Structure formats: structure tokens, C-alpha cells
């Protein structure tokens, strides 16, 4: 169904077929521990069954029905049906015994360490309880006389204990054993006879939750009922009927999946088949895994969440599991997103793999990621409304469209976003820069014409359907929608009209279209591939003329796939750790690979190792993305190496491709075959390449042809070293000028033997000044502009830096009548400095503006003291008028002070 994909990867079979009762897997160091009958304990460790350590452990007297791990400290705890409790430590590469204990009275039914690993709770069947420190010292012990426990957990903070009760009843205590309340078991509505707790598991939130206030605590019962709470007294939990006899339950390490282990009566037999069912925290069913054997006994996830160990009938199986990550690739950025220990947001990372940079964006309520070209959509829950955060390849949001439908399924296209609930789909047309017809919404049982740029009828979206949506896809030419009936609907784009309804023998788990939009690659709910040729005419066995043909192709365990962007019949498809690239229906040689199919164009498939990236998402490495070459490209690269550049061209003339002409061109350039390189650039129409071979074909020196051709690939450091070895420091600086490495330009000019050109040191400093000033680092720009004699931007820096002593010593340095003095004078006016502005307007020989500045800043003394001008008498009439206006305001003391500033001492 919708979700992740998983398959049985391994087995381990135990000597004498000793039945396992329990298994659990360490997460800080990765040991498995498994407990079986007749005192069997074993510790096992996987490495890359071919396991790297396998130690049996001895001391138990019966079936080892409790095995449990301390993560925070290097300790395994175990007990059997004879009540010997043992804590083991890994010492000199061996699990030795550290402490031994026996109450001598009852079966130990269960245990749990607390969320900090400082305490263990141990619960007996008869009614006792112990809490003990990691020191081994006992803290307290009740005896809950009246009822038999059978289960335990802590709460996330370790303040509360859940004890189960064997009669299918749950009681909540504080961490001192004071009875608080009975828990409400609301999933047990409409039930008959006895109930038993099959399991309880509480995700303590350590990787962060799927959402704030998400369900955290799962409970399940032997009748197959399950109940997922937000906290210990959530009285409105998620309710599930699994339809099977459950034996146990486990969250994955990230708390994003619940696995439920059990068995179901087989559909045609009085015989049971073992199954694991996987659930979301919200109770949607992700999938079912069968396992062979008499009974599944127990269940546990690997610390990475990429394997799950299944203890079954004296065997441990390991299901590999391929997470349905919130991820996508856009324009040579990988987008990956993860929940955090210390935030409610998803930490979305835009890793620019072309430059190797991380841009990090914390997003609330992330539902999905999707990509097409340079843009991605982070679909999210709005703080019902949802928002499609259309975003670019470095992670800055462009247009958050709000929609009133749940974006369960999303398809993206170079013009369109399509989002769909189980019942209706919304299409939004987008670009970066009429607007009205660019959004529409449609119900899945509707029959739209295509013609109407109508308003969003969100009221139609809640009309109930018998066959909901389960997958969608779109191609820039059609939208294909898959129903749970196995009906598939074809709609047009850019406008949406219903073209045809098809029907098929399967539900679609995934759908994807070739670029020509005529072949649909359908993956069934069972993990089986098929191709459907959408346009193909068929004569039916009745003679009726059918359209749409199921092609003869079939393959199994398919879960990731990619039609090539350029070619209509190249396709790629994962099975396990193998990729089987196709041409038409015919598979190539399989390629060894773990990672997801990232991009497919120009005869190359990019692959990304998300499973490695997400182990340490803050320090990704170049190697976590790998490039594959499909067979036509590897054959052509092999011919060029074996048959040589001359005659390898015959295979490409026999079977040409624009990628192969470039390969022959770059090969011929590197071996200096300018004739064949010219023909290869001609055959792929590269006029930049044709000019480049001609330019090389005019040069006199082979050493210089090497230095120039080394440049073509982007090996600029090697070209520079070549020019320095050639005694062409001038061409070394010339290459750095062209590349803009002005620090290197200046470093070569400083370190060279020759007298560096003054105008070139000036150019070098001024370009480094500009480099920092354009990045708003004004204090850095000053360091270069003061060397590079750039007074006209040194002023802009001293002003933005707010250094009026700097800006003074700049303006005092200039010649009289210099073009910059009237702008520095205006800077001193905008900031309110009269003497500096007067100094600048006097060096500019611009005296009327000095007087006007003295007037504006009310320096009426300095305004009138410029006695060289007739204007002094004229402004005496303005001073009188201003004083008369202060006297109309009746401000006689200010008119006295103004006349004192005027030196009008008589008045």
C-alpha cells in the first residue's frame, strides 16, 4: 500500500532448532540479543548470515523470556522462567556477568529501563515490583496484592509507570508506585470473553515526533485490537482493528512507524500464516510482510531503522526496509528532511551538491517533498487549510499557495502542481516572474470537459466515494489518477478534461509516465512491475476495439523507478541492491547500488545514498551521490580506450548520440587530436568547441596547447601551475583575471619577481574592495579601497560604516573642485554636521550651499559670518522673518536667543 518498501534479506538458524521466545536489538552499538528455550541466550552482530560476532551465554535454567538493553550504559539485562536475573557487560570483547539476582518466588514477566538509562523497573507475575538503579542497588519494592501484572513501561520523563494487568487491564502509577488511575481501553468496544495485552510500546521522542502532539504510546491486545495514545490518559486515542492474532508491537527508532507482529488464519485453510503489519502513528496501514515458520515469537528494529529482526521458529529473519523519506532532487541540490531531538520543526536541508553547500530551513508540519526542474514543493499543514510552499534549489520560498484539501498525493510538472486527497484533486499552474485560470479543483467521480477556468468549488471535495484515489502522476501532457478499484483515469493538461477511463487487474502502489506520455509504468500493491501502453489499439477476444494494452513485461520487488528525461524508451528500475536499466522491454546488465534513483538524462543515472546521509545529516560527503553510465556510454568509453580515438568514431557514426560526440571530443582534445575533436564538436553542433579547437590549432607551443586545453575541463589550478612552469606568470595572472580570483591575482603580483603594474595593483585592490562591498562587508571593502585609491566608494563605505572621522579624513584629502566633495558635503548634511559640510562646500568652491547649510542647521552665526557675500544681508531679512514667526508663536526667549546667535545684540 502507500508507504515504504521491505523484503526478507537474511536468515540465521539456531542449533538443534531451539525455539526463540524473545529478541531485542541494541541501538548505540548494534548487538542483537536473542533468548530461547533450555537456557539459550546468544549475542549476534551484523557487519558489511555473515555476522562478525556470535557468543552464546550460559547461567539460565529455563526459557529466557526477558531480554532487554540499556542503551546509555554498555549493559544487557536478562531473566528466565526460573527467576535468575543477570546483568552482563561487554568486557575485552566478551559479554561477562556483572551482577546476579534471584527473588526465589515468581516468573519475571517484564522489564523496562527508564528513558535516561539510570533505573530499571522489573515486574513479577504474583504482584511484586522492583525499581533498581544502574548501580544495581534496589530503590523501592511494592507488592500489588490483588492482580497479576504481565507488562510495564515508563513515561518519556520517567515520572509515570504503566503497569499492565494480565486480565487485559492497565493501571497508571507514579514513579514511587502510588496508584493514580485505571487507563481507558476504548479499542475494546464490542468484545466478548477474556482479553490480554499483547504489547505496549511508548516512543520517548528522542529523534523528535512526526508532529507536535502526535500519538506516542501504542497498546495492543491478543484479539488484534490496537490503540495509540498522545499521553497516558488520552481518552480519544487512535483506534485500530488489525484483523490478526497479535504477539507483540515495536516503534522504529524515529517513532515514525509502528510494526505489529502476529499471525492470521490463512484464506483457504485451518492453518495460520505469520505476518508483520506496519502502521503510521495515525493508524493508516503502510503494508504487510509474510514470514515462513511455525510461529513468530518476537520483533525488533535495528538502531538505524533499515532492518527489522523477526524471531520465528528457531530462526531470526531480517527484513530489509527502504524508508519512504521526505526527499527530492532539484537542479543539482538534494533536498532531505528529518525530525529533530530539540525542535518541533522538520530540519529541511537543501544540499547544493554542485558547489557543496548546505542551506537549512526549519519547516513546521511537513507532509511531503516533491521536485521538477529547479523548483521543489514542501507541502505542509497550515498552523482544513494546507500550504504548498513552492521553493527554489537553495531553499528560499517563492509562493506559498493555501489549499482547503489534504495534499495526500502530489505530482509536480514544469508548469503544474497537482495535489489530491482520497476523493478530489487540485491543479495549480506556476512560473517565476493571465493569472485567473491558474487554479482548479475536481472530484474523482466527476466528468469535467476541460473548458472551464472555474472558481474553486471546495464544497465538492467532501462528497463521499466508494473507490478513493491511491496514486497519481502527471507528464506535462496528461494527468493519470489511480483508484483503489484498479480503475485508472486519464485527464488532459494544461486544462483538465476526462479523456478515458481504463480498468486493470490491480491497485497501483506507484505510477510514472515516459516523456512522450504513451507508456505508463505501474507498480502493483504486491511490488510487481507492469507497462501499460495507453494509446495502443487492441482487438479484444470478443472482436471489440479496446484502447490501452498491458504489455508482456513483468518483474518483482520493484519499488523505485525513473523514465529517462530525454529518451521515450530508456527506463530504470530498482529491485534490491541492483538496478536493471531497460531499453524498450529489454533489460541491460544489472548495476550494483543501494541508493535511490536521483536523475536520468544524457545516458547517465545519478543515484543518492539517503541511508548514509541521514546517519549524520549535518556533515554529508561528496561520495553519498554516485553517477552511473548506461551500457551505450560505457561501451563507447571502452572503445575509445581499447580501439583508440581514430576508429572508435566508427561505432558512433554507426549508432550516434549527442552525449557520445562530446565524449569523443573531450577525449580527442586531451590527446591533442584537433582534427577529430573538430569533427566531434561539429557532429554535436558546439560552436564554442569548434572555435576552441581552431584557436588551439593556431598556437606554436605544445606546452601552451597543454596549458590551454587543461583549462577547458575546469582544471584552472593545473593550467596556472603549467603557466608558472612555462615562465608565463603573465598568463597565470591572465587566467586568474578571467576567473575573478582577485586574491590570487594580488598574491601572484606580490610574490612574483617582476615589478607589479601600478594600474593592475589598483585594479586588483578595487575588485577585492568591490567583492566585499557587494556582499555588504563595508569594513573589509575599506581595507582594499584605501590601497586601490577608490575615493568614490570609500565614501559610501565610511558612511554605511558610520565613521564620520573616516569620512572627514577622506573629504579633507581631496583637491578643490573635486567631483566627490558635493556628495560628501550632502552626507554631512543628512547626518546633521555643520562644520564638516561647511568645510566640504568651501573645498568644492560652492559657497551658497555652505550658507544654506548654516541656515538649515540653525547655525545663524556661521550663516552670517561668511562676510565675503551680498547674501549675508539678504539672509538677515530671512532671520528677521523667522524671528517674527517665533514671536507669532510668542516664543520671545527663543527670539532673544536667535538674535543673540545673529549677533543682533541691540535687539
Amino acid at each position: 500500500f502507500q508507504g515504504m518498501f521491505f523484503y526478507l534479506s537474511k536468515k540465521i538458524s539456531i542449533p538443534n532448532n531451539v525455539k526463540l521466545q524473545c529478541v531485542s536489538w541494541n541501538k548505540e552499538q548494534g548487538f542483537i540479543a536473542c533468548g530461547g528455550e533450555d537456557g539459550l541466550l546468544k549475542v549476534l552482530k551484523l557487519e558489511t548470515s555473515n555476522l562478525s560476532m556470535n557468543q552464546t551465554l550460559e547461567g539460565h535454567s529455563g526459557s529466557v523470556q526477558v531480554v532487554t538493553w540499556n542503551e546509555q550504559y554498555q549493559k544487557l539485562t536478562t531473566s528466565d522462567e526460573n527467576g535468575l536475573i543477570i546483568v552482563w557487560m561487554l568486557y575485552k570483547g566478551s559479554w561477562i556477568e556483572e551482577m546476579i539476582n534471584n527473588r526465589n518466588k515468581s516468573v519475571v514477566r517484564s522489564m523496562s529501563w527508564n528513558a535516561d538509562g539510570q533505573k530499571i523497573c522489573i515486574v513479577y507475575e504474583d504482584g511484586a515490583v522492583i525499581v533498581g538503579s544502574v548501580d544495581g542497588n534496589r530503590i523501592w519494592g511494592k507488592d500489588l496484592k490483588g492482580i497479576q501484572l504481565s507488562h510495564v513501561t515508563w513515561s518519556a520523563d520517567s515520572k509515570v509507570l504503566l503497569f499492565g494487568m494480565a486480565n487485559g487491564e492497565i493501571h497508571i502509577y507514579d514513579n514511587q508506585g502510588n496508584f493514580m488511575i485505571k487507563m481507558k481501553l476504548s479499542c475494546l468496544v464490542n468484545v466478548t470473553g477474556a482479553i490480554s495485552i499483547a504489547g505496549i510500546h511508548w516512543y520517548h521522542g528522542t529523534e523528535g515526533y512526526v508532529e507536535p502532539d502526535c500519538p506516542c504510546l501504542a497498546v495492543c491486545f491478543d484479539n488484534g485490537r490496537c490503540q495509540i495514545m498522545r499521553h497516558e490518559n488520552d481518552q480519544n486515542p487512535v483506534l485500530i482493528d488489525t484483523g490478526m492474532y497479535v504477539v507483540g508491537i515495536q516503534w522504529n527508532h524515529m517513532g515514525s512507524v509502528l510494526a505489529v507482529a502476529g499471525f492470521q488464519k490463512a484464506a483457504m485453510q485451518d492453518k495460520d500464516v505469520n505476518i508483520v503489519q506496519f502502521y503510521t502513528p495515525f493508524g493508516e496501514h503502510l503494508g504487510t510482510l509474510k514470514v515462513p515458520g511455525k510461529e513468530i515469537s518476537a520483533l525488533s528494529w535495528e538502531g538505524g531503522g533499515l532492518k527489522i529482526a523477526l524471531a520465528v521458529d528457531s530462526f531470526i529473519y531480517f527484513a530489509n526496509i527502504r524508508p519512504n523519506y521526505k526527499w527530492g532532487y532539484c537542479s543539482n541540490t538534494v533536498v532531505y528532511a528529518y525530525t529533530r531531538p530539540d525542535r518541533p520543526e522538520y530540519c529541511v536541508v537543501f544540499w547544493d551538491t554542485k558547489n557543496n553547500e548546505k542551506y537549512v530551513k526549519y519547516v513546521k508540519g511537513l507532509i511531503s517533498i516533491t521536485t521538477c526542474g529547479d523548483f521543489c514543493i514542501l507541502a505542509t499543514k497550515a498552523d482544513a487549510t494546507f500550504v504548498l510552499v513552492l521553493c527554489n534549489s537553495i531553499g528560499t520560498p517563492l509562493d506559498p499557495k493555501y489549499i482547503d484539501i489534504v495534499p495526500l498525493f502530489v505530482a509536480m510538472t514544469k508548469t503544474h502542481v497537482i495535489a489530491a486527497s482520497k476523493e478530489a484533486f487540485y491543479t495549480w499552474q506556476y512560473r517565476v516572474a493571465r493569472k485567473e485560470g491558474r487554479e482548479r479543483i475536481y472530484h474523482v467521480d466527476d466528468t469535467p470537459s476541460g473548458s472551464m477556468d472555474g472558481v474553486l468549488d471546495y464544497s465538492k471535495t467532501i462528497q463521499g466515494t466508494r473507490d478513493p484515489i491511491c496514486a497519481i502522476t502527471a507528464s506535462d501532457k496528461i494527468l493519470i489518477v489511480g483508484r483503489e478499484s484498479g480503475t485508472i483515469q486519464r485527464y488532459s493538461l494544461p486544462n483538465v478534461g476526462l479523456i478515458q477511463k481504463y480498468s486493470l487487474n490491480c491497485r497501483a502502489y506507484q505510477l510514472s509516465l515516459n516523456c512522450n506520455s504513451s507508456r505508463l509504468a505501474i507498480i502493483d500493491i504486491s511490488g510487481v512491475l507492469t507497462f501499460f501502453d495507453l494509446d495502443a489499439r487492441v482487438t479484444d477476444s470478443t472482436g471489440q476495439q479496446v484502447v490501452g494494452e498491458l504489455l508482456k513485461l513483468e518483474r518483482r520487488d520493484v519499488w523505485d523507478m525513473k523514465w529517462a528525461k530525454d529518451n521515450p524508451d530508456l527506463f530504470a528500475m530498482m529491485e534490491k541492491t541492483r538496478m536493471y536499466v531497460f531499453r524498450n522491454l529489454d533489460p541491460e546488465e544489472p548495476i550494483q547500488t543501494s541508493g535511490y534513483i536521483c536523475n536520468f538524462e544524457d545516458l547517465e543515472i545519478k543515484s543518492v545514498l539517503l541511508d548514509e546521509i541521514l546517519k549524520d545529516p549535518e556533515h554529508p560527503n561528496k561520495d553519498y551521490l554516485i553517477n552511473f553510465e548506461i551500457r551505450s556510454l560505457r561501451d563507447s568509453r571502452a572503445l575509445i580506450e581499447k580501439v583508440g580515438i581514430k576508429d572508435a568514431s566508427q561505432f558512433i557514426e554507426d549508432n550516434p548520440h549527442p552525449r557520445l560526440w562530446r565524449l569523443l571530443a573531450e577525449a580527442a582534445l586531451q590527446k591533442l587530436d584537433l582534427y577529430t575533436a573538430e569533427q566531434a564538436f561539429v557532429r554535436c553542433k558546439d560552436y564554442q568547441g569548434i572555435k576552441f579547437v581552431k584557436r588551439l590549432g593556431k598556437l606554436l607551443s605544445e606546452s601552451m596547447k597543454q596549458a590551454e586545453v587543461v583549462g577547458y575541463f575546469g582544471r584552472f589550478e593545473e593550467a596556472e601551475r603549467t603557466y608558472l612552469e612555462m615562465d608565463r606568470r603573465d598568463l597565470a595572472i591572465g587566467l586568474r583575471l578571467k576567473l575573478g580570483d582577485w586574491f590570487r591575482v594580488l598574491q601572484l603580483l606580490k610574490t612574483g619577481s617582476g615589478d607589479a603594474d601600478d594600474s593592475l595593483l589598483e585594479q586588483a585592490n578595487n575588485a577585492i574592495g568591490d567583492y566585499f562591498a557587494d556582499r555588504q562587508k563595508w569594513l573589509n571593502a575599506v581595507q582594499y579601497y584605501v590601497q586601490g585609491r577608490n575615493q568614490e566608494r570609500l565614501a559610501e563605505c565610511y558612511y554605511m560604516l558610520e565613521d564620520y572621522e573616516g569620512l572627514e579624513n577622506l573629504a579633507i584629502s581631496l583637491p578643490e573642485n573635486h567631483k566627490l566633495l558635493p556628495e560628501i558635503a550632502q552626507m554631512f548634511v543628512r547626518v546633521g554636521m555643520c562644520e564638516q559640510a561647511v568645510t566640504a562646500f568651501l573645498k568644492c568652491s560652492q559657497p551658497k550651499a555652505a550658507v544654506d547649510t548654516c541656515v538649515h542647521l540653525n547655525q545663524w552665526n556661521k550663516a552670517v559670518e561668511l562676510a565675503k557675500n551680498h547674501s549675508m544681508k539678504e539672509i538677515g531679512s530671512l532671520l528677521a522673518r523667522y524671528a517674527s514667526h517665533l514671536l507669532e508663536k510668542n516664543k520671545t526667549l527663543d527670539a532673544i536667543e536667535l538674535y543673540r546667535k545673529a549677533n543682533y545684540f541691540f535687539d
Binding site: 537553495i394 517563492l398 506559498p400 564620520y804 547626518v831 546633521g832 536667543e897
Partner: protein, 702 residues
């Protein structure tokens, strides 16, 4: 601090105690000899519940919201369903005083003159357990494990859930200081317990306490309030009063206290017992002050029978400067946040915080009875080590406050005062109308410019070293908000009709306006670009072009580089600008030299390449050179170096230069037309001959 009367009613009689349904939908009041049921939205009284004979001295209501308990002078207690029927009557030894349900188990208590009557739901018996004294008031520990009782004898004593007595404290003076109410603080993990739900007969007849975390508010008629642990230890000191207090009480949050009494008001306090303000003052004694569940509303009951329902509004207090958001936390702390490094510092006062202001290296904070000046100890722009520089022990009245390098600036209601640090006044300015807005606009230390907006719509610049105020502009409506662009050449104004207006300051002329704005800021570095918020949108506008609109609620406080410091209803959010969008608005206009300034703040390599080739085809080789250096594409840098190496040595034919650009781009037919029209048909012959395109090459011999 602000409080608004949402609704009021008056009963026929005095009002003795108050209960809320846990979802806040209904209020129940013990008025005289009946229970009254009210809607909290508007105070409609739904029903007088009739069951009792005499004075209903109290009511309380269980955490599951199914059942409430009410106690009478007629000795009865009645358990009412939320269907408002009294399914289980009970009858105590004497008149009832206070009743209180347990937070966890729904076990009830019911106090009387000597005896307190515990029982757990629908068991057949009640523990009528004995007391030394009149049992005035009762409150369960936050984890449900102890019932604490206050006595008229001036003792508080602590009883376990079974009724055994474990701890005592006596107020020094005994029966001089009756305990009229006490309350355990709600602040522990259990407050969300029962916060997840979507669902007449008669009833007959503890160690390591210092490690238990609970805290008890005690209000005594010795006219003092004090806080106590379950260990019996007093926390700090007695917070003295000048009234007989009643009903010491808390919000759901556990951080703010309500305190009613013979002061005839509802006073508001911190959890440390420092005063913060006044909810509505009253005609008569206040007996009860109950905070609404999940929310900032309050309800009050008085001796005269008035019920009053108040909303507390808790206004926002902050200042930003360039990149240091300082804001009020609790109501007593400033949190100062460096917005680039995301560092926070907490400065704790010991009073209310009323006003904050900030400027380079200077922070100022106003309390009720002093003003604090704080200083960064280093010139390092990443520093956060604020020390108190000076502390002015003087009371002030103000509308607005700002701080400069050496001065505090106070706006009194039509008058601007400059005060030195150390409180001595320097200068003062009197406006022609009431001041609506002020901002500091920078300057040299001690001559800083201030930007001032008046109710008459006049806008002024004032220099702190000058006695005269300089008119920048006048407008047809009041200044609501006000900002200056990075160079100080341009002004943005909000006109108190919810529009933004934008002006040239050097020429005093309007550039443009926008019809929906509430707050506005210029980009602190990139001039000709600004942001505003209004009507549920954020709005980014560049250089008179169209405006980018997206949904937001909250207000623009500032704008730096690629980030807009929008403020949500409690915290700063830092929205990011789509730089790619204003960049393409410059490129539609062929403004390449300008487009690079939007790009240079951060855009994709696709944006840089699309800028670079637009500059290259626009023959802006100085922009294109830099736009390609960002991508580091040597192919087109070699072409640009060729065209510059032909502009040097005296070529000038632009059509020949565009032909080369179109040749490298593979725009061959357009390159060929340019090679023809530039006068060089032989270059078009060479281009198609070299491409071996002989069906086109034949044209160009001539």
C-alpha cells in the same frame, strides 16, 4: 497591562464561590441559596438550579467535566451531573465552607466546622475525618497526593489522600491571621492530564517531602501573602499587603497570580508575589477571582452580588535597532536576541517592565519607579555581555521612549525631553501637536538625529545637540508609523488610514503609495527596497515596480539582507525574501546594473546564469563578467575577454559583438543576420561552413 470588561451581571444575593467547566463553556456561581449557570461568552444566565434549602457557601467542579459538588448552610452537599441533575445528595455534620475535587482520581473533599468528608467516585461511604479547627479552605497538591487545609486558627496543615495529617505550619500570631484561601501552583506535568477528551439518591455515613516539588500560595488576614513547600519550609519572605486578601488564585499556566479582597479589586502578581497590575476595581469586597481555563480571561464575584467577566490583553513591548531584538518575557524580564548569531540573553528585573529601547551598544528599560541603562562591554558586534551602566531612581510619565549614545529621550504627551545618563536634563522641545511616533535615525555620538511624527501629520527631524526642530514634511493625516531608507534620502510613512506613503526627503516629494499597510521597514542595506504588513499579507516592494504579496499575520519590525524580521503574537519569525523575483523585475526593464544588486544578496546559479546572459546580450560586459564569475563559467568569460580585447584596439560595432554572443549561444540564424547587417557576411559564411551547414552557408558569398 490592560484589562477589558467583556460582560457583567448582578445576582439577587452575594456570590460565595465560582466554578468553570474545564473547556471554559459554562460558569457556575454559588449565589445566595441557589446555583446559577452562565455562558462565559456573553453572561446569559441559563438556569437557577434549585436543590439546596439555605446558603450555597461554595461550588467546585471535577477535571473530567462530568460532575460538580456544591455545599450549603443546610448541611447538604450535592453531586450534580453536567446534565444539571443532582444524582447523589450527601449531608455533613455542620455547614459547608469550601469543597475541592482531586486533579487525578476525582476523589472529593468537603470541609466544615470540624470535619472534612473524603470520598472516591460511587463508593458507598465517606471518610468524615476530624480537625482541630474551623476548616476554611482546601486545595489538592498538583499530583493529587495531598489535600492541604487552611484554618481560621492561622495554621495550614497537609493531609494525605487517605486523610492522615503529615505536616503543619503556624503563621506567627495564630488566630490573629485566619487563612481565607490557599492554592497549589498548577505548574507541573499533570496539567495536560484530562486535557484529552472527546466523549436523586443519598450517600451514607509519604516520605522525602523535601524532594516533592509543589508550592502553596497562602493568603492570610494578617494581611500578608507567602509561598510554602510541602516540607513546611517558607519560600523567601512574606509579601506584605494593605488589605484583607481573599481567593489567591492562578491562571492554567501557573506563572501569574490573581488576588482579590477588601481592597475591593482584583490585583495581579507574578508567581514570586511581585505586583504587576489591576484587573477591574469594584464597588464592594471581592470574595472570588477565578481565571478561565486555557485562556487569559478572568471572572470576579463581590459582596454586592456583581459578577464581572474580564479579558486581560497583555500588550507587546520591544525594540530592534539594526539586528538586536529586545523584548518583554514574563512581565519582568527582557530577552535580547542577536538576530544574525541567534544568541539570546535574559536580563531579570524585580518589577514590571513598561518600556524598552535599544541602539548600538546601549539598551534602556523603564520599570514603575526607575529607568535602567545597559551597556555592551566590548565594541565586538557579536557581543551580548550587557552590564548596567547607570540606574536613574526617578519616576516618569511617558508616551514613547528611545535611547542614543549618551542620552535617554523621553516623549511626554506633547513634549520631547533629552536626559543625560545620570538623569540631569540637557534640552527639551515642544511640538505644535501631540506626538504619535518617534525613531532614532543614527548620527555621531551626542548629535544623533531623531525622526518624529505628529497627530496633525507634520514630520520633523530633531538633532539632540540642537534647540530647533527641522520640518521634513507635512501630511493630510496623522503619522501611525515612520521609517528612513539606508542612505537617509527616502521616507516611508503609515498615514493612520491604513495606507503606506513613500517620500523623497531631500526634495520633499511623494514617490508612491500603497492602499493596505499597518507597519513598514526599509531594507537596512539594499536601498530602493522595502517591506510592509497589512490585512493578513506581507508585502515586499522594489524601486516603484509591482509588489510581492504572500499571506502572513504579525508585523514587520525590520528588514536586513535577505530576511524580514516579522513579529508573531509572542515571538520574532524571520521570513525570507524571494530575491529571484525582484531580480527578474529589474531584468524585464533591462536594468542589469540594478538586477545584480538583488542577485548579490543570494540567488541560485540558475538566476546568476539567466542574469549573466541577459547582461551579455544587453552588451553590459561589466555586469555579465561578474554575473558569470559567480557561476565561474570560463567559456563566456573568454568571449567577454575577446570583446573587451576588441573594444580595446578600436572596434565599436555592437552588431558584430551581439553576433558573437548569438554564435556562442547557438542562436545561429540570428547571429547570421547580425553578421550580415554589421557589414561582415563572410563571418556568417565561415560560421555555417564550420558547422558544415551547407544548405544555409551558400547564401553568404557576395
Amino acid at each position: 497591562m490592560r484589562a477589558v470588561l467583556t460582560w457583567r451581571d448582578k445576582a439577587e444575593h452575594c456570590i460565595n464561590d465560582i466554578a468553570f467547566k474545564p473547556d471554559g463553556t459554562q460558569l457556575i456561581l454559588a449565589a445566595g441559596s441557589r446555583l446559577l449557570v452562565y455562558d462565559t461568552s456573553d453572561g446569559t444566565l441559563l438556569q437557577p438550579l434549585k436543590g439546596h434549602k439555605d446558603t450555597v457557601y461554595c461550588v467546585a467542579y471535577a477535571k473530567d467535566g462530568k460532575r460538580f459538588a456544591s455545599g450549603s448552610a443546610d448541611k447538604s452537599v450535592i453531586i450534580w451531573t453536567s446534565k444539571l441533575e443532582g444524582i447523589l445528595k450527601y449531608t455533613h455534620n455542620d455547614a459547608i465552607q469550601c469543597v475541592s475535587y482531586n486533579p487525578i482520581t476525582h476523589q472529593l473533599a468537603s470541609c466544615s466546622s470540624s470535619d472534612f468528608g473524603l470520598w472516591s467516585p460511587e463508593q458507598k461511604s465517606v471518610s468524615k475525618h476530624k480537625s482541630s479547627s474551623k476548616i476554611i479552605c482546601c486545595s489538592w497538591t498538583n499530583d493529587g497526593q495531598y489535600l492541604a487545609l487552611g484554618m481560621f486558627n492561622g495554621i495550614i496543615s497537609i493531609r494525605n489522600k487517605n486523610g492522615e495529617e503529615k505536616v503543619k505550619i503556624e503563621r506567627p500570631g495564630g488566630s490573629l491571621s485566619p487563612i481565607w484561601s490557599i492554592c497549589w501552583n498548577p505548574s507541573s506535568r499533570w496539567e495536560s492530564f484530562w486535557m484529552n477528551r472527546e466523549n436523586x439518591x443519598x450517600x451514607x455515613x509519604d516520605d522525602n517531602l523535601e524532594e516533592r516539588n509543589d508550592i502553596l500560595a497562602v493568603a492570610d488576614w494578617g494581611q500578608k501573602v507567602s509561598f510554602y513547600q510541602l516540607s513546611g519550609k517558607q519560600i523567601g519572605k512574606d509579601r506584605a499587603l494593605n488589605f484583607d486578601p481573599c481567593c489567591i488564585s492562578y491562571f492554567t499556566k501557573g506563572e501569574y497570580i490573581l488576588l482579590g479582597g477588601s481592597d475591593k479589586q482584583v490585583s495581579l502578581f507574578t508567581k514570586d508575589g511581585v505586583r504587576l497590575g489591576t484587573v477591574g476595581e469594584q464597588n464592594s469586597w471581592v470574595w472570588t477571582c477565578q481565571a478561565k481555563p486555557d485562556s487569559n480571561y478572568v471572572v470576579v464575584g463581590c459582596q454586592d452580588g456583581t459578577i464581572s467577566f474580564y479579558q486581560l490583553i497583555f500588550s507587546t513591548v520591544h525594540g530592534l535597532y539594526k539586528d538586536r531584538y529586545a523584548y518583554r518575557d514574563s512581565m519582568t524580564d527582557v530577552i535580547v536576541q542577536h538576530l544574525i548569531t541567534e544568541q539570546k540573553v535574559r536580563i531579570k528585573c524585580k518589577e514590571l517592565v513598561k518600556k524598552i529601547a535599544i541602539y548600538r551598544n546601549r539598551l534602556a528599560i523603564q520599570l514603575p519607579e526607575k529607568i535602567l541603562i545597559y551597556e555592551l562591554y566590548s565594541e565586538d558586534l557579536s557581543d551580548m555581555h550587557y552590564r548596567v551602566k547607570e540606574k536613574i531612581i526617578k519616576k516618569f510619565e511617558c508616551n514613547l521612549l528611545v535611547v542614543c549614545a549618551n542620552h535617554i529621550i523621553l516623549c511626554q504627551e506633547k513634549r520631547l525631553q533629552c536626559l543625560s545618563f545620570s538623569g540631569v536634563k540637557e534640552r527639551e522641545w515642544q511640538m505644535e501637536s501631540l506626538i504619535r511616533y518617534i525613531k532614532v535615525i543614527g548620527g555621531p555620538p551626542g548629535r544623533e538625529g531623531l525622526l518624529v511624527g505628529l497627530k496633525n501629520g507634520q514630520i520633523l527631524k530633531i538633532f539632540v545637540d540642537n534647540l530647533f526642530a527641522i520640518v521634513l514634511l507635512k501630511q493630510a493625516t496623522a503619522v501611525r508609523c515612520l521609517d528612513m531608507s539606508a542612505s537617509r534620502k527616502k521616507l516611508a510613512v503609515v498615514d493612520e488610514n491604513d495606507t503606506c506613503l513613500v517620500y523623497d526627503i531631500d526634495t520633499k516629494e511623494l514617490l508612491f503609495q500603497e492602499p493596505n499597510a499597518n507597519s513598514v521597514a526599509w531594507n537596512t542595506q539594499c536601498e530602493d527596497m522595502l517591506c510592509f504588513s497589512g490585512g493578513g499579507y506581507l508585502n515586499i516592494k522594489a524601486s516603484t515596480f509591482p509588489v510581492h504579496r504572500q499571506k502572513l499575520q504579525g508585523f514587520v519590525v525590520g528588514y536586513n539582507g535577505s530576511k524580514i524580521f516579522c513579529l508573531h503574537v509572542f515571538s520574532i519569525s524571520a521570513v525570507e525574501v524571494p530575491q529571484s523575483a525582484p531580480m527578474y523585475q529589474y531584468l524585464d526593464r533591462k536594468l542589469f546594473k540594478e538586477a545584480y544588486q538583488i542577485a548579490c544578496l543570494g540567488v541560485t546559479d540558475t538566476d546568476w546564469r539567466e542574469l549573466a546572459m541577459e547582461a551579455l546580450e544587453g552588451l553590459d560586459f561589466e555586469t555579465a563578467k561578474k554575473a558569470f564569475i559567480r557561476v565561474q563559467d570560463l567559456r563566456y568569460l573568454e568571449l567577454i575577454s575577446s570583446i573587451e580585447e576588441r573594444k580595446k584596439r578600436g572596434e565599436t560595432n555592437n552588431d558584430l559583438f551581439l553576433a558573437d554572443v548569438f554564435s556562442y549561444q547557438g542562436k545561429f540564424h540570428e547571429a547570421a543576420k547580425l553578421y550580415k547587417r554589421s557589414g561582415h557576411e563572410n563571418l556568417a559564411l565561415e560560421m555555417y561552413t564550420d558547422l558544415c551547414m551547407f544548405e544555409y552557408a551558400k547564401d553568404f558569398l557576395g
